[PDB]
Structure 1
Amino acid sequence: MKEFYLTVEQIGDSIFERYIDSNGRERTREVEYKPSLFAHCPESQATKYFDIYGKPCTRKLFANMRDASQWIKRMEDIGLEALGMDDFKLAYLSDTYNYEIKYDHTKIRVANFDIEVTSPDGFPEPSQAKHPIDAITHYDSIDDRFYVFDLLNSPYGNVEEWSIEIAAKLQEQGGDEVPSEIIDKIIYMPFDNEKELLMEYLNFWQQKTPVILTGWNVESFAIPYVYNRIKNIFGESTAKRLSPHRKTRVKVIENMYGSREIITLFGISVLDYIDLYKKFSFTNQPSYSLDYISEFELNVGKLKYDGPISKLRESNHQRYISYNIIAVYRVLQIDAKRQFINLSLDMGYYAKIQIQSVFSPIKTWDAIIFNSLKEQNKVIPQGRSHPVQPYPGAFVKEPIPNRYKYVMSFDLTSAYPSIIRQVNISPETIAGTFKVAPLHDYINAVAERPSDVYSCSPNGMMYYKDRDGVVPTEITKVFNQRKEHKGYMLAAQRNGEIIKEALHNPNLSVDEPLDVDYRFDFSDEIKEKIKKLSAKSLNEMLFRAQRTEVAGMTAQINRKALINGLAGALGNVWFRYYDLRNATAITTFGQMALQWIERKVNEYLNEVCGTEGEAFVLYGDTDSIYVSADKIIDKVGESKFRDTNHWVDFLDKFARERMEPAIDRGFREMCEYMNNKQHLMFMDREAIAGPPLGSKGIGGFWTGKKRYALNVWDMEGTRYAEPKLKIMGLETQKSSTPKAVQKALKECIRRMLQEGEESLQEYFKEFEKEFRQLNYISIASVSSANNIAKYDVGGFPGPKCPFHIRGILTYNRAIKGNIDAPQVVEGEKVYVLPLREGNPFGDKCIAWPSGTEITDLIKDDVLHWMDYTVLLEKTFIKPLEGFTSAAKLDYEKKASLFDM
């Protein structure tokens, strides 16, 4: 097999590399890598190295990496560009792996761990590490084993060994229901004292040194706690054994409002799963506790116990250890589903970076572009300093607030990367500027043609047409990978819909789920067999279809995120290829494209309908248009349709056969107008929306920009067994809105769109009547908590104090005295509730850490004093009044003459 790196580090003048050799074995080596860097040189000097602008360069080979670094400094003191890859480990990987990396994940050691630390005096600060580590579960992907390190004797209690037999048993048997599929994979090791546990853990770690290190909050808690605890007990050199090169550094993580400390373990690639999830999941959660995320992703129930976690070890050590094991398995289960580790490995190896660099799009792209250019013997410019400057982004059309009955939407495929490809936007393809007309003149095709030579953007930039730039070339490769996974994702989705349909008629038989590849559209034979299957089999197939779809979604959406990241990296000062001319060429072209095509679709449809000046395009945002299809439906007449699916087919056919070719011609003309390199504006139909045939549903509504709801029958070629709501921006979509309120508002919208005004007033009247019975958590608002200290004036609100911060200060006073009570963590999320006047808390609201029950000390009072009236009006009535006046209907029945 072809070798591949596992980790790479620079330590002084050595590269330290862990790798898989040609025989599949893990090795380590130290290499005294001699970097090269580059200077411009005279024309009449024979060279094969050229900067990206075609100017000749001489290569300077250095005795060691420290000499290259010092040289870089001296070149600045002189005032001359020191060209080339200044991150020497990236050049090493480029030199050592000069081919497309074929990796084998079964050879990569992936470690998932979680620790327990009993603490009587509140939260155990990792930087202090003053309490014993009393449990470690460490899963190893190569052995496929959970190694459990269990402390039996502690200053906080002596306990009995954990029992695997009780662990296996049902919760109803007094057991812990550790899942049976992992019971045989546990290797349990009890310890008589902490020193021995840790000494064994380090010996184990040495034998099985993680390549990828993950788990939940490992970077901010587990790793620094373990590192600091071992440091305190044994000294630094023993603690540095967590690094296979014995090198670590304390790294300061700075945000807008403060900082924290993490430990960098050289020769390990730490991918904290909480950070993986935040980057790759495309959710925004009320809480990031593992219990909350586990429940959301897997639908497994909260790990439940009596009393505080601080007393769990002594009161119930058995459950304590079982929950530590289960917590590690939960992360694995989320990964089996979401496939973020897999994704990280793909992108890291593709870019030829340290795997943990996948968190940085600037670093990922710096390495992709470096490797690409290195291939042609080209030399990358030096990074330069830039002042941060604002620049313009997308156009968004102001919709007329209203109900909209029949809606068809269209949207550019990979808008910004397509613009980059079409215009040929790249650092080294800039050819000059032209005299710009106001944008409006390009939109209406009255401005002078920008160039008869170069490919243009309406921001005034021109680009070469003879050759593709390195940015379009490399962005195209990732785009193609994206398109492939999206194909599998959509197939799995359409397959899901076939299964749902079939489920309306399950057969009464005992059978097995079919062995099929869900990434591919179900053939006729598979369709036939599906119609003969039981509900049990069908459900299992649905689950598998949805897993395949989730796998496709992770792969496609984060490749989209990567390529879109490049368009934005052109506008970040830290990017080697930062250039506001290119960042703006992209965003300005986009604004033009949207408005240009709005004009064309309008002209086209007015033509088809024999009208003039009618606005068919009601809305659009960035690269999308929403076309009113009322007139199209009416021209055939609702009477001619057999059912909802009949008009949906009609519109689908109209969009594909009439609208899309009209759209394509309009864009080809725009391409010629801008003299672009390649026509790449592909605007496919997204949504077909409307009310169910013969109902009183309103089908859709807009309240404003980025605020709308649509009843959707077909999305990108997926025909739904059941209509689906596409709701954007509204309170149902916000993590700040109470869960029960999201759910109630969603149902009001479903009723408005599918059933009508009368159904809506029915549901409202009932929700208003019963809502006070809802669990307090389900009706709490959610907010991030920044700058708690800034607004804290002796425990009371300072001037301009935010409502949610006020809530926290109210909380802090109510629990003052107790180091046992959970503290709100700065920068994390809180639940917020209003309090009725003259409550014992002395203020109008209270907030507490999100994803948790509020402590028992105050819970009773909170419940008694909760202001259901305020809460109702703010979270439910206000947005609902927003929706319904927009849609021009009433949530309460107005008096009529029939009342008499």
Structure 2
Amino acid sequence: MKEFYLTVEQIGDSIFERYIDSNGRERTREVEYKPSLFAHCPESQATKYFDIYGKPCTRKLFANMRDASQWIKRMEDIGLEALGMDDFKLAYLSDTYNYEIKYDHTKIRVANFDIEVTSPDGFPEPSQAKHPIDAITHYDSIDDRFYVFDLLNSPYGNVEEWSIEIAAKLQEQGGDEVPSEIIDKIIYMPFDNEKELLMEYLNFWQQKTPVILTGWNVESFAIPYVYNRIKNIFGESTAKRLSPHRKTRVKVIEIITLFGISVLDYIDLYKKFSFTNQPSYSLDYISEFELNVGKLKYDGPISKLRESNHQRYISYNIIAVYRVLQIDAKRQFINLSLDMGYYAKIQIQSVFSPIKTWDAIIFNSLKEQNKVIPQGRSHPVQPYPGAFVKEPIPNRYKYVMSFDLTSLYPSIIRQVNISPETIAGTFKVAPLHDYINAVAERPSDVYSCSPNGMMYYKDRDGVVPTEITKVFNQRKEHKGYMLAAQRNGEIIKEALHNPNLSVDEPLDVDYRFDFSDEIKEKIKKLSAKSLNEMLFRAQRTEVAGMTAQINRKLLINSLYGALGNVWFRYYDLRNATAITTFGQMALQWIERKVNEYLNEVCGTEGEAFVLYGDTDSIYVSADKIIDKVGESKFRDTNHWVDFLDKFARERMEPAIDRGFREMCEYMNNKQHLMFMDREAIAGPPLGSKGIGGFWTGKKRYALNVWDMEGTRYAEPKLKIMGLETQKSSTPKAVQKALKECIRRMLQEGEESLQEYFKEFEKEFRQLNYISIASVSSANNIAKYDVGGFPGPKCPFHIRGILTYNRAIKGNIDAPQVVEGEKVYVLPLREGNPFGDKCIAWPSGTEITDLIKDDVLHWMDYTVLLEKTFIKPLEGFTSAAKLDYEKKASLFDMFDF
């Protein structure tokens, strides 16, 4: 098979690589890599290497990587550009795998582990590792087995062996209910003492050295703890065996680097790719959210769980590892990282960096053409102007239709042809509104321009535009393979109904393309065994297709971020500004064209149809469109939705397109790519008293949506942006209540809202304290801690933490609030024994029993309700011109 790397490191003048050879066997090798860099040379000198500006370069081959680095410094010292890939690992990968990498994940050892450390005197710090490791579950993807290491004897107690039969029994039977599917995959191993457990775990590790190492919070806890515990007991020399190259690097107060291993802590993968913001990141919490699986329940402190219920302690360790696996089975973040890493040809852990990922993608592409990348240069950090956001008039908006531009920034880069080497010059700029109103003179008759004054060549597609266009088109291809494989899968399922009783084999087809009628016919004749094998292949193809297209998507959307980063090799302030400024013109230009068009077709003058707009979208008030015809005319809700859908697709789109083409010519761009499609159609149920939607201000609105891009919903769905219902800092119960209030406003009306408001306010007191607690990240605690008392300008949540700290002092085993993590926050009635107006504790958890009852008895319900629920609800109704309080008479409906 095709060879591919697993990991790569640079240690001195040598590169250490673990890879899968032709035979599919994992190998290792140390190479004295001789890198090359480049420098400009006189024109007279013929060479095949040219930088992106078309200038000739001479190749400099070095004896070792050290010599190359030193050369760069001397060139910097002298003040001349030193071109080429300065990250030698990347250059090494590029030279060694000079082709599109085809990898086989079944050959990559992905390890998922978790440890337990009974610690009576507080949290067991990894840097100290002063307490024995009494449990370790390590799942290996090649073996598909859960290896469990259990310490039976420790200074904290001697226990009996763990029982798998009791582990299997359901909870209602006193068992731990360890998933039936993994029970037969557990390799249990008891140990008489800790030294023996560790020695065997370390041997196990050297035999099955992880390639990808994951788990929950393994980078900040499990890894450093295991490393230091082994170092303190057996010596540093033995601890370094955790690295397949026996090279580690301890980053002082403490992150441990194991060379030859790619660590992808799942907590980081989750934060990087889930596009959410959770109130807590404890595995239990994330687990409930993702899998709806209750919390691994156990009684008492964890520090006494092994001693009191060793059976449960061990099953707890096992299930913790399994949950992460379940999350990944659903999110596929590991496979996404592999797919992305191999596409760019970088160390897999580099997927966390758009800059590193795109630099490699562009490097490999340019190298194939024998071109030489520019030296990375330092730029002063300067913020540039961003997107345009219209100030909306706060109010209710009955009918609304929105339109979105397709991948705006990437599309702008391609249309205008923006790249460092395509800069052709500048033109005299007029105020932005002059280009928006087509008043200013045409910037150029020869170059492609942006309203910020920049001009670019049109004869050639630039480096960045070409690369982004490639990824753009590739996503189309893979998403297409995904869909075809999906459909092809249905055909095979349709056939599995009555499989022939034949002797045959799986048809050798390409599942990325819709089956022809010839293949469909043949499939109708296949046997059950053959068809099932085909369905398996069809699905594997679909999954791969999904992952590739998602990977392509992330790349497309992260390019702009990179281009706006001073550390990116292709960063250019003028180019970043050209992109965003052109984006502002595009949105406001089309806003004008849409208002002009709509006023014309509705036979009216100077009417403002575009009610809002942000970055790449506009929201059109369709009220007058509905009136021009008349509501009575519409049979039912679905009728007017159909009408507006047709009105958009047949009359507005063409006008928007004509509008953008004019703009493209005006700016003399390389090609038209400003495509704006109809997104949502919002409104209240025909007949009802609902208001449909509302805006309270910029980036804060709510809409009752019936159709999203041609997808007609069975039931209208609420699209809420910015409002407290969407914020992780809003208490759970309040998020839900505020959402029902909005639903009632948009779909049913004022009286419906008033009814619900009164009820929630009356039952408020009975809600679980955790459900009505606010949440907040806690940064710089120490900064405001003076003698355990709040200092000047101390934040409300920080004060709460200090209060909690003062009340748990002296209690060695009390849960500690951690710097940079999140906490629940509750206000306290004056006179409370805590000594302050509020208290905070670790989010995603119950507050410690030593003060729980007191907190529950001094919680200030009145302030809670007013601040988290009433204040924001008043803001919604004020903007919507509604009353959340029922009145006694008609005249009471007015502000007399």
TM range (shorter): over 0.9
Q: Distance in 2 between matches of 1:546 and 1:620?
A: 40
How big is each residue's C-alpha offset from its partner over 1:436-456, in whole Å with a ceiling of 9 and x where there is no partner? 111101100111111111111
Q: Does the C-alpha gap of structure 1 residues 489 and 873 become closer, same or farther in structure 2, counting only changes over 3 Å?
A: farther
How far is the alpha carbon of 1:472 from its aligned partner? 1.1
SS in 2 for 1:386: coil
Contact residue 39 and residue 57 of structure 2 kept, 8 A? yes
Deviation at 1:636, TM superposition (A): 2.6
Give the equivalent residue in structure 2 for 1:257: none
Instruction: Measure how far apart 1:513 and its partner are.
Output: 22
Classify 1:172/1:32 alpha carbon distance in 2 versus 1 (closer, same or farther; 3 Å): same
Q: 1:737 to 1:322 in 2, by over 3 A?
A: same
8 Å Cα contact 1:337-1:547 kept in structure 2: no
**Deviation of the 1:70 alpha carbon:** 1.1
1:90-109, Cα deviation, whole Å (9 max, x unpaired): 00110011111111111111
Q: Deviation per CA, 1:374-433, whole angstroms, max 9, x where unpaired? A: 111111111112211111000000001010011010011111000011111111111111
* 1:522 aligned counterpart, secondary structure: coil
Q: What per-residue deviation string (whole Å, max 9, x for no partner) do you get for residues 316-349 of structure 1?
A: 1110100110010101100010010111011100
| Superposition deviation, residue 493 in structure 1 | 13
Deviates most, 715-724 or 726-735: 715-724
Which SS does the other structure have where 1:305 is aligned? coil
1:497 — aligned with what? 490
2:339 touches 2:551 (CA, 8 Å); kept in 1?
no
In the TM superposition, residue 560 of structure 1 has moved relative to its aligned partner by: 3.6
Q: Which residue of 1 aligns with 2:322?
A: 329
Q: Distance in 2 between matches of 1:527 and 1:709?
A: 47
Contact 2:6 2:20 in 1 (8 A): yes
* Alpha-carbon distance between aligned partners in 2 of 1:535 and 1:175, rounded to the nearest angstrom: 39
Change (3 A) 1:5 1:192: same
Distance 1:106 1:828, change over 3 A: same
TM-score by length of 2: 0.93
- 1:227-257 per-position Cα deviation (integer Å, ceiling 9, x unaligned): 111111111111111110111112369xxxx
Q: Kindly tell me: are residues 460 and 507 of structure 1, through their superposed partners in 2, closer, same or farther at Cα, counting changes over 3 Å?
A: farther
**Cα displacement (A) at 1:742:** 0.2
State whether residues 394 and 591 of structure 1, in contact with CA within 8 Å, keep that contact through their aligned partners in structure 2. Answer: yes
Corresponding residue for residue 54 of structure 1 = 54
SS at match of 2:128: coil
CA shift at 1:458, angstroms? 0.7
Work out whether residues 335 and 547 of structure 2, in 8 Å CA contact, stay in contact via their aligned partners in 1.
no
Task: For residue 82 of structure 1, report the CA deviation from its aligned partner.
Answer: 1.3
Q: Find the counterpart in structure 2 of residue 305 from structure 1.
A: 298
What's the CA shift string for 1:585-632, capped at 9, x where partnerless? 110000000000000010010011011110000000001000011112
Shift of 1:556: 5.5
CA distance in 2: counterparts of 1:485 and 1:829, whole angstroms:
39
**How many Å apart are 1:479 and its aligned residue?**
2.4
Q: Cα offset for 1:642?
A: 2.6
Contact kept, 8 Å, 1:597 with 1:667, in 2: the verdict is: yes
Q: Distance in 2 between matches of 1:18 and 1:546?
A: 30
Give the count of matched residue pairs.
893
Question: Secondary structure at the residue paired with 1:393?
Answer: coil
Is the alpha carbon distance of 1:525 and 1:627 closer, same or farther for their aligned partners in structure 2, counting shifts above 3 Å? farther
Distance 1:496 1:858, change over 3 A: farther
CA change 1:31–1:146 in 2 (3 A) is: same
Shift in Å, 1:532 = 25
- CA drift of 1:46 comes to 1.3
The change in CA–CA distance for 1:493 and 1:593 in structure 2 (over 3 A counts) is farther
* Structure 1 residues 512 and 107, CA gap change in structure 2 (3 angstroms): closer
SS of the residue 2:221 aligns to:
helix
Change (3 A) 1:39 1:521: closer
Report the CA distance between 1:477 and its aligned residue.
Answer: 2.5
The more displaced of 480-489 and 284-293 is 480-489
Aligned in 2, Cα 1:474/1:885: closer, same or farther, shift over 3 Å? Answer: same
Deviates more, 1:331-340 or 1:550-559: 550-559
Q: Alignment partner of 2:798: what SS?
A: helix
Deviates more, 1:534-543 or 1:154-163: 534-543
Does the aligned pair in 2 maintain the 1:384–1:576 contact within 8 Å? Answer: yes
How far apart in 2 are the matches of 1:72 and 1:381? 13
Distance in 2 between residues matched to 1:135 and 1:881, nearest whole Å = 53
Q: Displacement, 1:537? A: 24
Query: Between the two proteins, what is the percent identity of the paired residues?
Result: 100
Which of 596-605 and 529-538 deviates more?
529-538
* d(CA) in 2 for partners of 1:97, 1:453: 42
Deviations 1:681-736 (A, max 9, x none): 11011111111111111110000000000000111222211111100000000000
Q: Note closer, same or farther for the CA distance 1:787–1:374 as it changes in structure 2 (3 Å cut).
A: same
Cα deviation 1:505-540 (Å, max 9, x = unaligned): 999999999999999999999999999999999999
Partner of 2:698: 705
Deviation at 1:2, TM superposition (A): 1.1
Question: Structure 1's 505 and 145: CA in aligned 2 closer, same or farther, altered over 3 A?
Answer: closer
Q: How does 1:92-103 map to 2 (within 5 A)?
A: 92-103=92-103
TM-score, structure 1 as length reference: 0.93
Given that residues 514 and 541 in structure 1 are in contact (C-alpha distance below 8 angstroms), is that contact kept between their aligned partners in structure 2? yes
Tell me if structure 2 keeps the 8 A contact 1:280–1:554: no
Cα distance in 2, alignment partners of residues 2 and 683 from structure 1: 42
Q: For residues 619 and 516 of structure 1, do their structure 2 counterparts lie closer, same or farther at Cα, with a shift above 3 Å needed?
A: farther
Deviations 1:746-774 (Å, cap 9, x if unpaired)? 00000000111111011111000101111
Unmatched 5+ stretches in structure 1: 254-260
1:167–1:175 contact (8 Å) kept in structure 2:
yes
How far has the Cα of 1:561 moved from its partner?
A: 3.7
2:502–2:526: 8 Å Cα contact kept in structure 1?
A: yes
**Does the alignment pair 1:566 with 2:547?**
no
**TM superposition shift of 1:202:** 1.2
Q: 1:205-239 CA distances to partner (integer Å, 9 max, x unpaired)?
A: 11111111000001111111111111111111111
- The answer to whether 1:544 aligns with 2:566 is no
Over the residues paired in the alignment, what is the CA RMSD in angstroms? 5.0
Residues 320 and 519 (structure 1), Cα distance of their counterparts in 2 relative to 1, 3 Å cut: farther
Contact 1:344–1:358 under 8 Å retained in 2? yes
Q: CA deviation at 1:638?
A: 2.0
Q: Which moved more, 1:873-882 or 1:502-511?
A: 502-511
The farther-off stretch of 502-511 and 874-883 is 502-511
Quick one: distance in 2 between partners of 1:36 and 1:60? 5
Cα separation, 2, equivalents of 1:597 and 1:576: 34
Distance 1:730 1:94 in 2: 47
CA distance in structure 1 between the partners assigned to 2:642 and 2:499 by the alignment: 27
Give the whole-Å Cα distance in 2 for the aligned partners of 1:868 and 1:533. Answer: 68
Aligned residue for 1:291, secondary structure, equals: helix
Matches within 5 A, 1:357-756: 357-483=350-476, 559-756=552-749
* SS of equivalent residue, structure 1 residue 603: helix
Are the counterparts in 2 of residues 280 and 558 from structure 1 also a CA contact under 8 Å?
no
Distance 1:30 1:533, change over 3 A: closer
Q: C-alpha offsets along residues 122-175 of structure 1, whole Å, 9 cap, x if unaligned?
A: 111111111111111011111110000111111111111100000000111110
Matched residues in 2 for 1:334 and 1:882: separation? 38
Structure 2: runs of 5 or more not aligned: none
SS at 1:344 equivalent: helix
Q: Show CA shifts across 1:772-791 (max 9, x none).
A: 11100000000000000000
CA distance change for structure 1 residues 773 and 536 in 2, over 3 Å: closer, same or farther? Answer: farther
Shift in CA distance, 568/778, structure 1 to aligned 2, threshold 3 Å: same
Residues 556/398 of structure 1: CA separation in 2 closer, same or farther (3 Å cut): farther
Q: Distance in 2 between matches of 1:653 and 1:549?
A: 33
Corresponding position: 1:846 with 2:822: no
| Rounded Cα–Cα distance in structure 1 between residues aligned with 2:772 and 2:488 | 37
Do the aligned partners of 1:739 and 1:779 also contact (CA within 8 Å) in 2? yes
Mapped contact 2:392–2:612 kept (Cα < 8 A): yes
1:572 CA drift (Å): 1.3
1:474-508 per-residue CA deviation (whole Å, 9 max, x = no partner) reads 11232234445667999999999999999999999
CA offsets, 1:627-675, max 9 Å, x none? Answer: 0111122223222223222211111111111111111111111111111
Change beyond 3 A, Cα 1:405–1:511: farther
Within 1, Cα distance between the matches of 2:572 and 2:485?
A: 40
Q: Secondary structure at the match of 1:848?
A: strand
Bigger mean CA offset, 721-730 vs 508-517 = 508-517
Contact 1:494 1:718 in 2 (8 A): no
> 1:309: how far off?
0.6
- CA–CA separation in structure 2 for the residues paired with 1:712 and 1:821: 48
Distance of 1:537 and 1:874 partners within structure 2: 64
- Greater CA drift, 839-848 or 496-505: 496-505
Alpha-carbon distance between aligned partners in 1 of 2:482 and 2:472, rounded to the nearest angstrom: 15
Give how far 1:894 is off.
2.4
Distance 1:209 1:693 in 2: 64
